[PDB]
Amino acid sequence: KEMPQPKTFGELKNLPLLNTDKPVQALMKIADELGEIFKFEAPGRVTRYLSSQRLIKEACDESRFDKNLSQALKFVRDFAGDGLFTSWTHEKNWKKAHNILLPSFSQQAMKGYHAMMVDIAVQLVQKWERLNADEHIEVPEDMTRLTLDTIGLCGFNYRFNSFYRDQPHPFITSMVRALDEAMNKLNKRQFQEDIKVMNDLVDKIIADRKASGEQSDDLLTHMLNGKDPETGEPLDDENIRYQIITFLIAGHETTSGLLSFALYFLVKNPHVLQKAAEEAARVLVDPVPSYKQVKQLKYVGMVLNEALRLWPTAPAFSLYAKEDTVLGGEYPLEKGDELMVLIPQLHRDKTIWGDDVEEFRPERFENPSAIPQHAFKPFGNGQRACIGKQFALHEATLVLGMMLKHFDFEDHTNYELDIKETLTLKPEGFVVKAKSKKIPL
Ligand code: HEM
């Protein structure tokens, strides 16, 4: 009933413990040491870090806890606004945008984004087909060029043309710089400029679209046409802008990190790569994959879920208690007390997964309804879960499937995993060589 806590440093409390490049990975070692819940304090603040399915299932009870805006999210809000990711559940625009957008993010909706997803996936595979013998691939870098450009095209029909450039489109530069400044806060002049570069481009495209009247297969058209069933109101132009920024911010690096970790685990486990490659070769019989083919990539799906089990690329989310309540019969909480769910630790809960938790075994997702409620949460929880989940999994299944169909991969550096932490996680410096199977594309 007395909650563990790691080392304090006077008035600085535990804060110096995350004054490090890799705070979630430091927080996992502390979980390893102290167990399923520990208190963590800074000058401003108190949270409790949760690591076990037993406690997290309670934290995921939406009658008892709701999403909290962590410090990270309030810093992101300076450019993400009241878009879905940085809004309180009780803010009017959270519910309006959630109701309007949800069906545009369904699995069914992926049929309409599929062609533009393919457009960028084909650009990626064609870059790699075109590398000379003496060349290798920078994996998180290329995955991020892919995911940015795909979210740009599917979100607002805009081409960042990241595969035509060494220096990204200036929106991307400002967005990436803005996100890093927001994360480093846990400069001011550049932050305002980068905010402006983002709103100006996105405002222009929205203003251009309303001018022309064109209908496209993008999220911007759906938002210009949507009406919230409850209020009957549409989203206004400002909020629509924030949502577009938000899809880019929330979706670019979580998804590129997933594709990166997945390829990492595959090159480190050749038997698994071979099984995935055999599926890809049997399923993707056409030079351009179809929507239906991507759905038939079951083992690729399992690969991605196993990568998400080990390194969920948005590894922590924050909750607050709605009312006074007792967690797990042992830990009294007050209204407003904060919890943090440490997803990498949840995903290593031996009582759910067995003792082999560090092993990469996609067969553990063979039968996805075996997995107990709230044991596997890379996309967060309940109504505040990732609205992008189907878009992310469709994108990654499509792209990994193509990669595995078109190339053999060599881990030519015997890469050693080094996980860089920002808002998200990625295997920094991961590189491979890809030898083409010379299959038509
Ligand atoms: C594998 C890739 C992804 C992962 C692991 C992921 C993870 C998450 C998680 C954990 C949350 C909950 C955040 C919290 O509780 O504070 C979240 C929310 C969200 N994500 Fe994702 N995300 C991914 C891809 C994407 C994509 C591609 C998009 C957009 C196209 C996206 C858009 C959003 C939005 C808008 C929210 C806020 C939803 C709401 O609260 O209404 N995400 N994501």
Curated annotation (Swiss-Prot):
Name the positions where heme binds.
C386
List its uses.
This protein is a target of protein engineering. Its selectivity-directing and activity-enhancing mutations have been extensively studied and the designed mutations allow this enzyme to act on non-native substrates and/or in order to enhance production of synthetically desirable end-products.
The site annotation (Important for catalytic activity) covers T254
Relate the outcome reported for changing A314V. Answer: Substrate binding affinity increases 5-10 fold and the turnover number increases 2-8-fold for palmitate as substrate compared to the wild-type
According to the record, what induces this protein's expression? Answer: By pentobarbital. Expression is negatively regulated by repressor bm3R1 at the transcriptional level.
Q: Which residues form the signal peptide?
A: none
Q: Where are the transmembrane segments?
A: none
Q: Mutating A250Q leads to what result?
A: No effective fatty acid oxidation. No effect on electron transport from NADPH to FMN. Nearly wild-type level of high-spin conversion with laurate/dodecanoate, palmitoleate and arachidonate
What does this gene product do?
Answer: Functions as a fatty acid monooxygenase. Catalyzes hydroxylation of fatty acids at omega-1, omega-2 and omega-3 positions. Shows activity toward medium and long-chain fatty acids, with optimum chain lengths of 12, 14 and 16 carbons (lauric, myristic, and palmitic acids). Able to metabolize some of these primary metabolites to secondary and tertiary products. Marginal activity towards short chain lengths of 8-10 carbons. Hydroxylates highly branched fatty acids, which play an essential role in membrane fluidity regulation.
* Protein name (database record): Bifunctional cytochrome P450/NADPH--P450 reductase
List the source organism: Priestia megaterium (strain ATCC 14581 / DSM 32 / CCUG 1817 / JCM 2506 / NBRC 15308 / NCIMB 9376 / NCTC 10342 / NRRL B-14308 / VKM B-512 / Ford 19)
Q: Which gene encodes it?
A: cyp102A1
> Which residues of the complete protein does this chain represent?
4 to 456 of 1049
